[PDB]
Structure formats: structure tokens, C-alpha cells
Amino acid sequence: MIRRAPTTLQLSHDDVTSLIDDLNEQKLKQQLNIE
Amino acid sequence: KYGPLGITNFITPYDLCILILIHAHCSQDNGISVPTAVFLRLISPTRPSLEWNPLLKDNSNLRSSSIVPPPVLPILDNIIRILLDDKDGNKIALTLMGYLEAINGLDSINRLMMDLEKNCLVNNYRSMKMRTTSTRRQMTRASFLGTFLSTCIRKYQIGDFEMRETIWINLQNFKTVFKHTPLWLRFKDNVHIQKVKNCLLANDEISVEDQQMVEFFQHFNNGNDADSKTMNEENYGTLISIQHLQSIVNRQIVNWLDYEEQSGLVFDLLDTLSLNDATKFPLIFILKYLEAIKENSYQTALDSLHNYFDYKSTGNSQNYFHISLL
Amino acid sequence: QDKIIHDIRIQLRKAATELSRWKLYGSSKWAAEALAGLAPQNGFGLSETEYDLYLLGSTLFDAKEFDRCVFFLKDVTNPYLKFLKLYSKFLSWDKKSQESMENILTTGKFTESQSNISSILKEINTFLESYEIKIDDDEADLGLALLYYLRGVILKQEKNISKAMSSFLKSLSCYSFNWSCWLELMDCLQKVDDALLLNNYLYQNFQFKFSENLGSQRTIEFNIMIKFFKLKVFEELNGQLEDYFEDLEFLLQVFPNFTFLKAYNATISYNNLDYVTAESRFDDIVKQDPYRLNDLETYSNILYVMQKNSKLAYLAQFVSQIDRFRPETCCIIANYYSARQEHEKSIMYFRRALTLDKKTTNAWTLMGHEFVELSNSHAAIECYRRAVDICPRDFKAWFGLGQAYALLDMHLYSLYYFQKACTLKPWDRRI
Amino acid sequence: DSQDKIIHDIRIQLRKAATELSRWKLYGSSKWAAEALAGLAEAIPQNGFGLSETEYDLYLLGSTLFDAKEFDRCVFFLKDVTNPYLKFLKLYSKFLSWDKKSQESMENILTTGKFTDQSNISSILKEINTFLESYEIKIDDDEADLGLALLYYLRGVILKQEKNISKAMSSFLKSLSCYSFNWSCWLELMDCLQKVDDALLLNNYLYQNFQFKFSENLGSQRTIEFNIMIKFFKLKVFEELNGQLEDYFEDLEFLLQVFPNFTFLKAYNATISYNNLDYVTAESRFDDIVKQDPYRLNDLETYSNILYVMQKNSKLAYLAQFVSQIDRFRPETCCIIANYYSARQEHEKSIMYFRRALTLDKKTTNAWTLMGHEFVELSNSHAAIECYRRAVDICPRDFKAWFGLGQAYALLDMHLYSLYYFQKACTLKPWDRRI
Amino acid sequence: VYGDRYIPSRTDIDFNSIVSISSMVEYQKERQAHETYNTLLKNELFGEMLSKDTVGSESSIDRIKNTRPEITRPSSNSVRGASLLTYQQRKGRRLSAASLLQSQFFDSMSPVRPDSKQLLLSPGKQ
Amino acid sequence: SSSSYRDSYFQYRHLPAPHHILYAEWNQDILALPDEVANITMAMMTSEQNSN
Amino acid sequence: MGVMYFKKNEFVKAKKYLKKALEVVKDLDPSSRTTISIQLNLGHTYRKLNENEIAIKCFRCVLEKNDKNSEIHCSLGYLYLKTKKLQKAIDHLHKSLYLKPNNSSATALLKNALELNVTLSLD
Amino acid sequence: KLDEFLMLSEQYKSRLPKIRKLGWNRFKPIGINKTMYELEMLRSRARA
């Protein structure tokens, strides 16, 4: 009897893309305050 | 002049001697033109391939219609004696003597090699007539000396630093051998060397600081014998390529079969092979075979005959078993 | 001086022999050499039934039959004979532990993985936990320091640098006067602000085991090579110097005609870009010790900038005459070919030198520069990367990547690479 | 009773024997000395050197710079020393610097020797003779230390490499008389022997007019009848030259009693069965070696030789993978694999490793004949002829090379042309049915 | 009973003989018919060297098929094939036993080798 | 500097002959695995069939 | 079960059961794809739970346990990008792309870090 | 007879560009998912 690798999941595409979008929001809104 | 003998696929110290003379001839600054007879005796043995079957064929094409001088051994004593004979040959010989004193380092050897490829050697005659602004004579690839120099240049870029390092150990070993000879004493000082040596030693870019340690780097490597010398591997006294050795042996067996030769020097040197030159050069075995028949030795002759047909058969891509039996 | 120099001689004799006894060539070579520069105490804890194994283990190690030594010492309950087996077990793995990507560059052939040291590290932890006397108190001896030093370097292999410092400092407290241990301490810094923090640890928190050491040596400031530690750190990275000039003078009065100090002292001139004074200091070393080849590639590097090819060629001829397969010989020869604009062949000899140590001085970076002149622009950027992985304190490695990426259309990568090198050497006007 | 007293004597001597030989940084005997002690039958450190503290500092510099491969730098610092213990170290550093240097000089050179069958070497020899005369013992005295005995070993080995045989033999005997239990000294002595009749002459000299320095050696050991090296000489020379056996039976069983766990003895014992074409018993003897000592790339070349004839391809395939995992730079590990690759009828690859196995150590001339065989199975007779012929030119007294060269002609129609080669092989081993 | 490695015995098969041995929709059927005829011919005409060779089990047909330059069970796994020299082969014969007289009997009615008969009796793929 | 004083890895003196680095390619040779790859010699999907 | 309850976006019973599993196996299984997997999964749950602090420590301890792993480096870079520690995340990203060739998500995250580095003007 | 010098000349001539040809094909940097072989390919099409 042998055990395979247990199920592990990593960063999906949806969450990393959502973080990309939010990161763009915060690097887009602050220069309006500067200007 | 004797020493251990070894086949070398690189620039032998003998090869630089021709390279020394051809530099003087082409530079035309000193106005010394090397006689055509001197060249045809030096480069011609180096020219590749003659071939000689053991028996079953005798001097079918090896014989020259015009009698040729014997090939020259790679010792500065033998080379100088060629140029020295002329009444004005001392000027030609001292030019070779001066250059061999000017090249005191490995970088200097590269200076001569770099000089010829960039300026002297020329790809084709069509660029010759456009190069009328050259102060030195230029040479075509297809010429007699051109095809030789291309091979010599090729034999310099084919090697790594270990190759260039063995060139300079052996040359100084080759040069210092001539120093302990009566001929050197006769030429101990002639003041033409100093003039020609200073012609090329100029533009050294330093004479006060680096030259003090340049001597140290050279002297420490050399055997000053003040202390125990730095220990190094045994180095051959003479370096010869396969083609040059072929000319010496072919001339020797032909002369044996039926300007003075040196039987003692050639036979002594050929007896010091490292047993691997004999494999690359199978004809040393038959040189014993011809001698063995002279004294009528049965067992000795057969062993040398069998040795010659074991190494030759493997080297020849063509089947040679049907020739061994005859 | 007075009895201080005499006290160094006796104890330095110890570090030369015991370190050489338990197959530490690098550390003993420095200590033995320090005897010559400086102007048979025997004893070990062994039994007759166990003393034979040490002779057995030592002589097989000398014959370079590494693996058979491990089997013949499969069980050893001796406190510090176990180190000799574990040392041989570590090196037996290391020679076959070549990273796949790095291997393509260092050879060019273009054609169980690490679980051993995981068992090796676990064995050391198991042995120490079950050992009778720990590092605490005035217990322990020379042998335990070797175990901790070996434990530290294996820890550095997995880049556990934070715990690696604790192991090495713990080994040095038990036994001082071990040079090879401190070399591995250098590679753990990779930063400037921690050095003073580590310096604060030595001045206040660190303490020596006076039981093993001789008199006037437990104290940190009377110790002689704590100055050597301070000398090494402030040349690898300048930063802000504390007592650097004052302690250097005291170490110069002691150890007359010590070649390592002069080579280090003259290397400072190279780091200060004072080439004319660098050659004079380097030249005196060559006269004194012609057969010393260490740090001779710096001599070739300085001569490369001056472009004294005639002088450089003789240096290559002299160096290659006495030895042809040491890393500095091939590095100098490879540096020579570059001067002849034969950048395509310098890679070969740089390649050969790397396969000798695979953790050298900045020979990785010089390999990368020669690729740039060939317009490869892709071997160089990856060749530069390997120098970063080994020594992240190298200015030239980081700069080569930023310089190379500048030629590339994407300049945005070059900003980060230049930023790291900017912190390392802010004094440069070019960066 | 007396045997147990001998056992207690050997342990003291072998502990001493491995001490200075390793302390003087020669590993030819140091590695063997510890091996003998490990396999010795179950039944404070010892050290001493007449060195002053001033000169003893130079020893640490000399010894540590030795194994760090910087032999030349050791010579420069150790130039002015006058103690014989250190004087040997300086010249040993010089010799190994040359012996090493010669190896890098030639690597493309497969065949070693001179076709007809110094000056830098003679510099070492003169220093030995100059120092020997100046020193105030010059052997032949009861008060003869280990170093002067060890110094003569360097003189013997440096003389042999110049081919000054019959003078190195005398030098080795003088060194051996003052200090036995130097295995590397015996091997150089064994090498200079060429024929069995010479061994009988040498064997007699060791018995009538040979005595050891009882002062240096421990008691109950200087006797020739109860020595061990004289015994080990008997099993070595008498069988490697395949000479007529005498005083060989009673000694062999005597060594098995004293050395029951010695790895070298069993492998030599296994080789004896191998040399007598008794393969089945040879396999059982060798199987004990692998289980007891799994990492020994010294005599496995015969083990992988036996397996090829056994056609135990699975067992051989295990060995090729296992041996190659240790290291691929020993002469044997590149010969073990070649046998495995030959059994699978892959000759163009097996031919490569045999050339590889020979390049690492040119002394292994047994690989030439095997390299020749893999050409004949490749239907390439021209290449085989040169391959066999090199083997006999290394040493004419090679029965394997002559026979393998004779067959290659017999495979072709040139039957008579092969008669000479077979005739030559007849004189080497007349007492063989096969030839 | 086991030959030495350094002094191998020579089989009767010659250099060029191995060169011969190793030489190689209705079109597919004809090609398959030609190949089995050629394999049978070279198996029967040769094999005296192969009969003298081998140590146990296996077959001369397997040796020929192993030469590099619905399936029934293969006997043994040796792929030695043709070879000029043999090491293992030292002349030796098993004592006659009842299986052998059974074997020589089914051979008495066969004008060809039993191995060739087995190859021919083997069914080609349809 | 300091190059040969550290002994924390496989160096040029740990192997017996320093000139073995000239070859330095025999380490990266995959040895043919025992049984199935014997079929690729005959062929010069099939190799796995011979393993079976 | 912890993975199972992570999939349905519950993020509480998943954490509880995974923590229970880890305390059960505190003593044994120091390596071999069991401690690594459970700790990595627990850190991933913490990351999705926005409790990035303890996630930093758990990902760091997994990384020091076993280092040749692209997933751990990519997730640590994501965790750092969640905060403002770009200097300590670009190195982890570069190591991750060194270890595994493509890592498309890691490439996009690193590119975003580059645009951030352009935008920021820190001394 | 095979010339040992001639065969060793072609061997040196073959290995010489091989060092220069190292970065072609397989070799790929970080941050660029395309190797340098087709960097010059698109460069060739750029002017042409």
C-alpha cells in the first residue's frame, strides 16, 4: 500500500487577478490626491 | 645537439627558424634577401607527404631528377652552418642570431605571429596591386612560402596556452644548447646582433621599473642553479613534425640503399623515441629492418618487419593485408 | 608584546596540529603558515579499541576513498570521532550535488537529490541531544566545536542563515583559533547593518570558554584574530569602520613578513582604486614567496586595467610553469586571453577554473563579461545570476545584470538590480 | 600461548607502523597498515620524534602544505632544514611534484615506455647522496632511526624510475632491514622483479644474509620465521608471477589464523581460485567481500570479470549501477561498467569505457587486450591489431596479448602469418593446454 | 568448464558470415511470406555455430532474431545473437535422459530442425 | 583575499589527482538501465515491449 | 477534510480540523509531504482569511523546512504584495521563476511588482 | 592514413563557435518567455 501526494491547492488565477485590479486601484487613486 | 625525440603537432622550434628568416626577407628594411637555395632546403622537407612502400616498389617517384641537399636537423648548430658558408652569410646568419636573442618571452613570439597575418600574408594577388602603400613585401596564399606560412599560422591558433607554454620552454632549451658549443664562442660578440636586436626591441614602453622584474620572471624560471631549480616535467630536447621526420628517414634509407650527412646524429636521435612516436611514425621500425638485413640477422629482422605491418595496416584505411604477405 | 607573543606561539601550535589531525586542510594551512610569519603538546580522549578507528578513518580519508570511511565508522559513540564520519558523508554527497542549470554553463556538454543532508543534519541534532555534556557551562572541548561547525555549514546549504549564525558563533565560543570556521561566517552576513549588530553581540553578549584556551585569550580585545575577523569584514564591505585603522597597526607589528597580511593590505589599494601603489605592494610579495599562488588573480586583474600585456604575459608564464591546475592559475591565464581580444577562448579557461572550486572569488562575474563582448547577452545574464546566488555581496555581479538588461528592450528589470548594487557600493559615481 | 603473545605484539607494531607513515604523508603503506590492524584477530597513544620546537614549527607548515597539493611551496620553505626526518619530506615533496607534473603533461599518451626498451630527476638523486654522506650514521649501525630507513626508500624509488635496476633493489633491502612493515616499499621491490628465477635468488638472500635492526623493531618480531611482511612477500610475488611454490602452504594458513577479517587477504585468496580457473568457488569467496566490505574498488575488476563469464547479467547490472554511484574516476569503476556494457552486445559503447579505464591509470595494461576484443566482435580487424600490439609493447611478457593478437589473424584467412604470434606465446606459458 | 575471459575460444562462424546472417493488401502478405522463408533459410543453413554455442534453453532462431545489425512464450531472455568469440562455451554435454530420447524421437520424423519446425508451425498474424 | 583557506565544500584537493578536471564530464552520463534498454540496440514503444 | 471545508468557502471548520490534524501529528512526520502539505494548506486558508501575519510565519517555516518549491515562493510573494514589502518580495518572485520555468501567475504578479517599483520613489 | 593534425584542426574549428552558440535554442532568461533564437528572427523581419 502506497499513499499519493495529499491534495494541496495554490494561488488560482481569479484571486491573483483580483489583487492585480485592486493594486491598480490603489496606484491609480493616490496620484489624483498628489495632483 | 643530441636529445630526446618527440613528434609534435605544434610549432616546433625549427619552425620558428624559418619564420625568423621569412620575417627578415619580407620586411625589406635591412635590404637582406635570403637566397632562394636556403629556402628550398628548409621549407621543402616540411611539405606534406611522400609515402614509401616497404618493398614491392623501389624509388618509383622518390628519386629527384635534380640532386637535392639532405634535409636539415632541427638544431641551431646545423641551421647556422648553412647560412654561415657564404662570405656574406654571416650577415644573414647574424640576422637569424639577432632575432633569436630578441624574442625573450612568449608575448614576443605572438608579436611575430601577429605581424605576419595582419600585414605580410595576403589572401590573393588581386589585393596585391592595391596594396602599393605597404612598406613590407606581401605574399600570396598559393605561393610556395604562402602555403607554408598558412599551415604554420594554423598550427598556432590550434593550441591552447599549454601549447604555447611548451613552445617557449623548448626554444630556450633549444637555444641554450647552441650556447654551449664552440661555434657560439666564435660568434660570442659580433655587434651586428646588438644592432639588429635593438631594431626590434625598441618601443618596449618601459625601461626603469617593469624591466627589473621582467628579468626576475625569466630568471627564476630558468636554471640559475643558485638554489635548487623549480621542479618540472621532463622536456624533449628536439621537436619534429611527422612530415619533416618522413623527409629525414626517406633520405636516410635511400642513401643507405645505394654535402655530408650525419648518420650518427640521425640514428642516435631516432633511438630515443617515447614508443608512442613510433606508433604515429611506423617507418622507424623498417629503418631497423634494413639495418638488420645488412648484418644478416634472422630473428631481429622478422620482429621489425612484423612490427611495421601491424601499425601500418591499422593506419591505412585501405586493406593492406594482401601487401603484408608479399 | 613580551609574553603575549609567546602565549600565541604555544596555542597556535595547537590549532595547527589538532585541526590538521581531523582532516581540516584549509584551517590548518592558515595556522601552520602563521607559525612561519610569527617572530609536541599532544592529548585526546580516546580508548585503545577506538583509537584504531581514527587511524583507520584518517588514512582512508587521506587516500581520498571518502565513502568507505563512512561504512567503517557506521557506529561510533566517541564525542568527536563521529564528526569525521559525518564530514566524509557530507563531502561524498557534495561532489555529486551539482545543480542542473549551473552545470550546463560550467561544462558546456548541454545534456536522493538533497535528502542526504536532511538525514545528515538530523543525525547531528540527534547525537547532540543524546550526548552527555552540552555546550553550556565550562564543559565541552575542541571536538564539540567541530560538530557545531559542521552543523552550521550544512544549515547554510539550505539557506538557513539565521540559525547558521547561532551555530557558528556557538562553535567559536567553545574553540577559537579556527580560521576555516570564520570564513563560513563571512558568507552569512550579505548585509551591512547586521555587521555592527553582530559586532555588538561579540562585544557584549559573546563570551569565550577559558578552559580550553590559554591565558589572555578568553578576553575578546586581547585576542589576536578577532582583529582578523574585523579586518576581513571591513574589506568585503566598507560601511562605517570602527577601530579599523588602530587594530590593523597592532596586527602589523606582530606577524612579521606574513604574506597573507601583505596580500590583504595591498588588496585594500585595489579596493581604493590606487593601482600604482597596488603593484608595488603586490610585487614585494612575489619576491618573498614566489611559490605562493593564492590571491594572485588580483595581481592579474590589476595588470589588466593597466594593460601591461608584456608584464602580464610573463606573469602567466611564471604562474603556469610551477602549477597548471589550480584555480588561480587558470583564472590568470583566462584573464590573459581577454587582453588579446580573444574573448571567445577566455571562457574555456574560466570554465576550467570554476570546475575546481565552484565557489571561488569573482570568477563567475569575469566569465559573464567575456560573453557580453560576444553579444550573446543570454549566457552572460545567466552567468551573472550564478554569482549572485553564491555571493550576494558582489557589486560586479549585480551591476552586470543591470548593465546587460539596459541593452535589452525591457529596462524595468534593470531598476531593481541596480537598486540592490546601489546599497552595496553607494560610493561609486557610475552606478 | 605463544600465538597470543604474537597477536599482542602485532597490535603494538601496526599501531606504530601506521602512525609515522601517515605522519610522514605517504599513503602507499599508511592505508594498508590500518587495513591490517582492522582485520587483526580479536584477543594511551604512542608517538615520539626527535625534533626541536624551533624546527617543529616548520613541520606543521611542511605537512599541511603537502596534502594541500602545493608541493612546490613546501620545498621553498623547507629548503634550509637539516634534520633527516624533514630532509626526506622536502625531497618527497619535490619528487611528488615531478610525478604529479608528469601526469598532467601526458594524458593523450596512452602507451608508456621507451621505444629502445633524467637530468631533472638526477637533481633529487644527488641531494640524497650528498645528505647521506654528511650524516653521521649512514646505515649499517644499530642506532639507525626510522627516517634514515625511510630516506632510503625514496632513493630506491627514484633509482628505479631511471631504470637503474639492481641498485634500487639493494637500497630497498637496506631500508627494509632497518624498518619492515612498509607495504609501499615492498611493492616497489616486487615491481623490479621480472622472472621467477630472480625471486628464488631474492628469496634466498632474505633468509641467509638478511637480518633486521632489532633496536628499531619490537622484540619477538625481528626473527625472519615469525615476521609478517616476509610472509606477505611470499603470497604476493610467488603467485602474481605464477612462480613455483615453496614455503607457501604453511605460511598461507598461518596468515588466515592471525588475519581472519583482513579484506585484502580474502580477495587475494579469492584471486587464487580465480587464477586456477575455478570460478564457482571464486564466486563464494568474493560474495563474502561485498557483504563484509561493500565499498572496495580494488579487486572488484576480477569480480565483474567473473560475472561476465557466469552470464549473471542481472547481478552484473547491479554492480555497474552500484559501483558507478561511488565515483567514476577510479581505474576499476571504468572497467566494471565496460564488462556490463559488453555483455549486452553494445560494443561501440563498451569500447569507449575501456579506453577511459586505461587513461585514468596507464599502469592497467590488462585493459588493452579487452579493448582489442571489443573490436573483433565489431568486425573491425584493422583497429584490433594495433590495440593488441600496444599491449605487448608495454611488456613483452604478456600471454594474453600475444594470444589475442594471434586469434585476430586466425579469424582472417592469413593462417600462416599468425603462426609466429602463436609461437611467441608458446614460450611464455608452455604448460597450458589452450595454447 | 568455464572459459577464461582473456583467452576466449573462437567459434566456427567467420567475420563475413555475420555480415550474411545480419542481412535482412497482398503486398504485405507477400513481404511477410518472403521474410519467414528468408529467416527459415538462414536459420537452417546456419546454426551449427549456434548449436555449439548457448548454455541452456533458448534457440538458434532467437539468436538470429536478436542479431542487431498472438505471440507465444519466449524461452529465456538472452539477446547475445551472433558473435565471433565465445567465453562461456566450453564443450560439455548433458547425460541422456528419458526426455532426450523423447526429443530425439519427435526429431526422427522431422526432416528439418525442431526449432525451424516450431517457427513454421507458429501462426502468423491474420 | 581568502580562497583556499575555506574547506566547507568539495575542492580541488579532495579528489586525488587535480588534473581529473580535464575530463569532468563522466559524472553527467546516465547509465543504461538494466533490462529494457537492451532492445534499443537491436532496433538501431519497442523498448517497453522488450521490457514486458 | 480541511481541504474539503476550504473548498466550500467556510474557512472556519477547515481551519479547526487542519489545526487539530497538525496538533495530532506534532511529534512525528517532520517531513515527507505530510507536514509540508498540512502547513501549506493552513497558511493558504489564513491568506484567504486575510490573517496575513501568522501566514507569513507559517510560510517562512515551511520554506526553511524545504526550499526547492515554486508554490511556496509564489505564495510568499503574494503575501508580501498584500502588504507593502515589495523589496522583500521581488527576490522571492525571481527565485520562484528560477525554480519553475513558466509560472504564468507568478510572472503577472512580478510584472505588477515592477510597475509598483516604477511608481514608488522611496529613498 | 588519417592525418592526426588535420582531424584535430577540424575538431578545434567545430568547438570554437560552439561556445558562442551556447545561448541559442533552449536557454531562456527570467522575465522573457522567448529565447534569443527568434529575437534575431523577428529582428531580421523588422528591417526586411
- Does the distance separating the beta carbons of F44 and E68 come in below 8 Å? yes
Rounded to a whole number of angstroms, the distance from the CA of G2 to the nearest CA of chain C is 28
F: neighbours with 3+ CB pairs under 8 Å? Answer: C, D, E
- In Å, how far are A23, B290, C46, C103 from C392, measured between CA atoms? 30, 71, 43, 20
- In Å, how far are B22, B33, B41, C117 from B138, measured between CA atoms? 11, 14, 22, 67
Q: Which residues are registered as beta bridge partners of B122?
A: B140
- Does the distance separating the beta carbons of H16 and C377 come in below 8 Å? no
Give the whole-angstrom CA distance, residue C302 versus residue C339.
12
What is the CA angle C266-C271-C277, rounded to 5?
45
Whether H4 has its CB under 8 Å from any CB of chain B: the answer is yes
**Chain C residues within 8 A of H26 when measuring between CB atoms:** 110
- 8 Å CB contact between F18 and C323: no
Give the whole-angstrom CA distance, residue C208 versus residue C220.
8
Residues 6+ apart with CB under 8 A from C115: none
- Does the distance separating the beta carbons of E55 and D311 come in below 8 Å? yes
Does C379 reside within a domain?
Answer: no
Chains D and B share 3 or more Cβ pairs within 8 Å: yes
Give the whole-angstrom CA distance, residue D304 versus residue D341.
11
DSSP, collapsed to helix, strand or coil, labels residue B121 as strand
Give the whole-angstrom CA distance, residue D371 versus residue D353.
9
Whether H29 has its CB under 8 Å from any CB of chain C: the answer is yes
Cα four-point dihedral sign D305, D309, D310, D316? positive
Residues 6+ apart with CB under 8 A from D198: none
**Chain B residues within 8 A of H8 when measuring between CB atoms:** 9, 158
Q: What phi and psi values does residue C7 have, to the nearest 5 degrees?
A: -65, -30
DSSP, collapsed to helix, strand or coil, labels residue G101 as coil
Q: Which residues are registered as beta bridge partners of E9?
A: E86
Does C403 reside within a domain?
Answer: no
Burial grade of B259 (CB within 10 A; 0-12, 13-18, 19 or more): exposed
Give the whole-angstrom CA distance, residue B150 versus residue B167.
18
E-facing residues of F in 19-48 (CB < 8 A) are: 35, 38-39, 41-44
Strands of B204-263, DSSP E:
238-240
DSSP, collapsed to helix, strand or coil, labels residue C208 as coil
Method: cryo-EM
The full set of domain ranges for chain D reads 1-367
Rounded to a whole number of angstroms, the distance from the CA of C139 to the nearest CA of chain G is 30
Give the whole-angstrom CA distance, residue B76 versus residue B18.
12
Breaks in chain E after residues, C-to-N cutoff 2.5 Å: 24, 69
Give the whole-angstrom CA distance, residue D239 versus residue D318.
31
Whether F51 has its CB under 8 Å from any CB of chain E: the answer is no
Rounded to a whole number of angstroms, the distance from the CA of F19 to the nearest CA of chain D is 6
**Chain G residues within 8 A of C413 when measuring between CB atoms:** 114
Give the whole-angstrom CA distance, residue C382 versus residue C398.
12
Could you tell me how many helices (H) and strands (E) chain H has, helices first?
2, 0
Q: Which residues are registered as beta bridge partners of B240?
A: B7
DSSP C416-430: HHHHHHHHH-TT-S-
- In Å, how far are B318, C80, E15 from B187, measured between CA atoms? 53, 72, 66
Residues 6+ apart with CB under 8 A from B207: none
Task: Supply the range of the domain harboring residue C30.
Answer: 1-363
Does C372 reside within a domain?
Answer: no
Which set of grid coordinates corresponds to residue E3? 572459459
Chains E and A share 3 or more Cβ pairs within 8 Å: no
Give the whole-angstrom CA distance, residue B78 versus residue B74.
7
- 8 Å CB contact between D168 and D139: no
- 8 Å CB contact between E82 and E46: no
Whether D231 has its CB under 8 Å from any CB of chain B: the answer is no
Q: Which residues are registered as beta bridge partners of D49?
A: none
C: neighbours with 3+ CB pairs under 8 Å? Answer: B, D, F, G, H
- Search chain D and give the residue with CA nearest E77: D313
Rounded to a whole number of angstroms, the distance from the CA of B238 to the nearest CA of chain C is 19
Rounded to a whole number of angstroms, the distance from the CA of G12 to the nearest CA of chain C is 33
- Does the distance separating the beta carbons of H1 and B154 come in below 8 Å? no
Which residue has 502547513 as its cell numbers? G39
Distance of CA A11 to the CA centre of its chain: 8
- 8 Å CB contact between B294 and B24: no
Which one of C53, C68, C325 makes the best mutation probe of the D interface by having the most chain D beta carbons within 10 Å?
Answer: C68
Rounded to a whole number of angstroms, the distance from the CA of D124 to the nearest CA of chain B is 9
**Chain F residues within 8 A of D314 when measuring between CB atoms:** 34
G: neighbours with 3+ CB pairs under 8 Å? Answer: A, C, H
Give the whole-angstrom CA distance, residue D332 versus residue D366.
11
- Search chain C and give the residue with CA nearest B219: C318
DSSP, collapsed to helix, strand or coil, labels residue C112 as coil
List the one residue out of C354, C375, C431 whose CA is nearest residue C105: C354
- Does the distance separating the beta carbons of G81 and A10 come in below 8 Å? no
- Does the distance separating the beta carbons of E80 and D381 come in below 8 Å? no
Counted domains in chain C: 1
Give the whole-angstrom CA distance, residue G33 versus residue G37.
6
Give the whole-angstrom CA distance, residue C407 versus residue C430.
17
- 8 Å CB contact between B170 and B4: no
DSSP, collapsed to helix, strand or coil, labels residue G52 as helix
Rounded to a whole number of angstroms, the distance from the CA of C138 to the nearest CA of chain H is 52
**Chain C residues within 8 A of B168 when measuring between CB atoms:** 317
Give the whole-angstrom CA distance, residue D359 versus residue F23.
10
Does C322 reside within a domain?
Answer: yes
Give the whole-angstrom CA distance, residue B13 versus residue D158.
31
Resolution at which this structure was determined, Å: 3.5
DSSP, collapsed to helix, strand or coil, labels residue C247 as helix
The partner residue sitting opposite C317, judged by closest CB among B160, B168, B232, is: B168
Whether H2 has its CB under 8 Å from any CB of chain B: the answer is yes
**Chain D residues within 8 A of F32 when measuring between CB atoms:** 341, 344, 346
DSSP B141-196: TTSHHHHHHHHHHHHHHT--HHHHHHHHHHHHHHHHHHHTSHHHHHTS--SHHHHH
Which one of G91, G97, G115 makes the best mutation probe of the H interface by having the most chain H beta carbons within 10 Å?
Answer: G97
Q: What is the CA radius of gyration of chain E?
A: 16
Whether E73 has its CB under 8 Å from any CB of chain F: the answer is no
**Residue C345, number of CB atoms within 10 A of its CB:** 18
List the one residue out of B138, B106, B133 whose CA is nearest residue B28: B138
The partner residue sitting opposite D410, judged by closest CB among E2, E4, E10, is: E10
Contacts made by residues B285-292, CB under 8 angstroms, sequence distance 24+ = B285/B311, B286/B54, B286/B253, B287/B249, B287/B252, B287/B253, B289/B54, B290/B253, B290/B256, B290/B257, B291/B256
Could you tell me the fold of the domain covering D1-367? 1.25.40
Rounded to a whole number of angstroms, the distance from the CA of H15 to the nearest CA of chain C is 10
Chains H and B share 3 or more Cβ pairs within 8 Å: yes
